[PDB]
Design a protein around this ligand. Structure first.
Ligand SMILES: *[C@@H]1O[C@H](CO)[C@@H](O[C@@H]2O[C@H](CO)[C@@H](O[C@H]3O[C@H](CO)[C@@H](O[C@@H]4O[C@H](CO)[C@@H](O[C@@H]5O[C@H](CO)[C@@H](O[C@H]6O[C@H](CO)[C@@H](O)[C@H](O)[C@@H]6O)[C@H](O)[C@@H]5O)[C@H](O)[C@@H]4O)[C@H](O)[C@@H]3O)[C@H](O)[C@H]2NC(C)=O)[C@H](O)[C@H]1NC(C)=O
Ligand SMILES: *[C@@H]1O[C@H](CO)[C@@H](O[C@H]2O[C@H](CO)[C@@H](O[C@H]3O[C@H](CO[C@H]4O[C@H](CO)[C@@H](O)[C@H](O)[C@@H]4O)[C@@H](O[C@@H]4O[C@H](CO)[C@@H](O)[C@H](O)[C@@H]4O)[C@H](O)[C@@H]3O)[C@H](O)[C@H]2NC(C)=O)[C@H](O)[C@H]1NC(C)=O
Ligand SMILES: *[C@@H]1O[C@H](CO)[C@@H](O[C@@H]2O[C@H](CO)[C@@H](O)[C@H](O)[C@H]2NC(C)=O)[C@H](O)[C@H]1NC(C)=O
Ligand SMILES: CC(=O)Oc1ccccc1C(=O)O
Ligand SMILES: [Fe+3]
Ligand SMILES: [Zn+2]
Ligand SMILES: [Zn+2]
Length: 341
């Protein structure tokens, strides 16, 4: 009657999608691809309907016709009387994080160090820090800036993948999906935590959700926030409590996208699904919780409170904002209307 095919990236997302499919009585069904870009293509072909995307991918999807439908909303102190689904989004803070013990490392001495990125093309892990680095160095050779990195989605034989570890068997090194040990917000933070890299380009929230006992993961259980510092654009180092005055930029929240012609439909189904498996849902945590995967951020971020309606009914450019869009455009000149497929 009103059924939606979700696109999952990699085997772990596929498994979560299947459980959701099952519990939804197949109001939702699953398609799987190895990368986010491949999922976008399935959506364009009409073989999948939707998936939730980081803003860097929304820019890609947007140029090819896809539109934002609902956005991730997390916990807030302000707008509190308003229901989550109607509450305006706030965005997240992109930060650069280092170990306190790595003394004297600042924004201005990052050259030739080792970096941990969520994935190529993502907002906090790539577009913001590389855009800044390209601007302040006046060169498009962002591949020669760090000595070694893990940036999932880059050429596996390049320096940008040297620090990537692949899966439990060493396969799939540097793939941009959760099979890669250092992929995503959690993987990049882990890459820093294990001292594989000197700096991780993540979001403020990641630091908090993976320290001081907030995560039981064996690599994270003994991590304390005091052992980390944020790098500020002014060359200072600050504690992680100061992200409001020490971030690289404010990113637009991850959002669900779909083909324009399927948007109304996707929106209707998802609003019903979250009533069922969302934060206060009929069936979470009883049977299935859509916004939980045990700090793995599968399909949606684990800190998501709800998916919220947009309003003003954005175009992708308005959703991302003119500040962010010009940032991406300029970075992309190193590698304006065309379809990347
Ligand atoms: C970086 O990322 C991290 C991780 O995402 C961010 O940290 C997180 O922030 C949230 C809150 O923003 C944490 O949430 C929770 O903690 C709350 C505090 O214990 C819990 O209780 C409150 O929840 C309610 C929200 O609905 C709110 O309740 C009210 O607060 C009023 C004041 O704001 C209060 O009024 C009294 O307040 C004062 C008392 O001393 C007096 O001055 C006043 O006169 C008055 O008496 C009301 O009575 C009422 O209680 C309130 O906003 C609290 O948040 C809540 O249940 C929940 O558990 C979240 O845990 C936390 N994550 C982690 C891992 O720590 C961080 O903010 C980010 N940083 C940046 C810069 O963005
Ligand atoms: C790397 O460097 C790149 C080169 O600088 C950089 O590219 C871009 O950098 C600028 C930031 O986007 C951009 O400048 C524009 O400035 C104006 C911003 O004005 C509006 O916003 C302000 C918000 O802070 C408000 O205070 C003002 O009220 C104002 O509204 C542009 O907007 C105009 O706004 C007013 C209307 O109020 C009006 O006069 C205009 O009609 C228009 O609406 C203005 O047009 C500039 O575009 C700059 O153009 C752009 N540079 C290039 C070459 O594209 C990139 O951001 C850097 N990368 C990173 C990651 O930092
Ligand atoms: C599968 O989707 C359908 C459509 O939303 C759901 O069936 C609806 O049940 C509600 C609850 O009263 C009614 O308002 C609708 O009229 C029903 N739709 C029709 C006309 O078939 C069903 O709840 C969904 N199942 C799950 C588990 O998500
Ligand atoms: C509010 C929405 O339409 O757009 C924005 C929000 C912040 C900054 C810029 C924009 C915009 O449209 O450019
Ligand atoms: Fe992101
Ligand atoms: Zn700021
Ligand atoms: Zn508009």
């Amino acid at each position: 009657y009103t059924r939606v095919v979700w696109c999952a990236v990699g085997p772990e997302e596929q498994k979560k999608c299947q459980q959701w499919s099952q519990q939804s009585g197949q109001n939702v069904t699953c398609a799987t691809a190895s990368t986010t870009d491949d999922c976008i293509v399935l959506v364009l072909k009409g073989e999948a309907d939707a998936l939730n995307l980081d803003g860097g991918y929304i820019y890609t999807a947007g140029k090819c016709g896809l539109v934002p439908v609902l956005a991730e909303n997390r916990k807030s102190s302000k707008h509190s009387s308003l229901d989550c689904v109607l509450r305006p989004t706030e965005g997240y803070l992109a930060v650069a994080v280092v170990k306190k013990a790595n003394e004297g490392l600042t924004w201005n001495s990052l050259k030739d160090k080792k970096s941990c990125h969520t994935a190529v093309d993502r907002t906090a892990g790539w577009n913001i820090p590389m855009g800044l680095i390209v601007n302040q160095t006046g060169s498009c050779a962002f591949d020669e800036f760090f000595s070694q990195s893990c940036a999932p989605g880059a050429d596996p034989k390049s320096r940008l993948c040297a620090l990537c570890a692949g899966d439990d068997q060493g396969l799939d090194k540097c793939v941009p999906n959760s099979k890669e040990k250092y992929y995503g917000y959690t993987g990049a933070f882990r890459c820093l935590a294990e001292d594989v890299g000197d700096v991780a380009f993540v979001k403020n929230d990641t630091v908090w959700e993976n320290t001081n006992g907030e995560s039981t993961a064996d690599w994270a259980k003994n991590l304390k926030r005091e052992d980390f510092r944020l790098l500020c654009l002014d060359g200072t180092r600050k504690p992680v409590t100061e992200a409001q005055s020490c971030h690289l930029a404010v990113a637009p929240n991850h959002a669900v996208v779909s083909r324009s012609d399927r948007a109304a439909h996707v929106e209707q189904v998802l609003l019903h699904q979250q009533a069922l498996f969302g934060k206060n849902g009929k069936n979470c945590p009883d049977k299935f919780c859509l916004f939980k995967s045990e700090t793995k951020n599968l399909l949606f971020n684990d800190n998501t409170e709800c998916l919220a309606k947009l309003g003003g009914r954005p175009t992708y450019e308005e959703y991302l904002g003119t500040e962010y869009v010009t940032a991406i455009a300029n970075l992309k000149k190193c590698s304006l209307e065309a379809c990347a497929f």
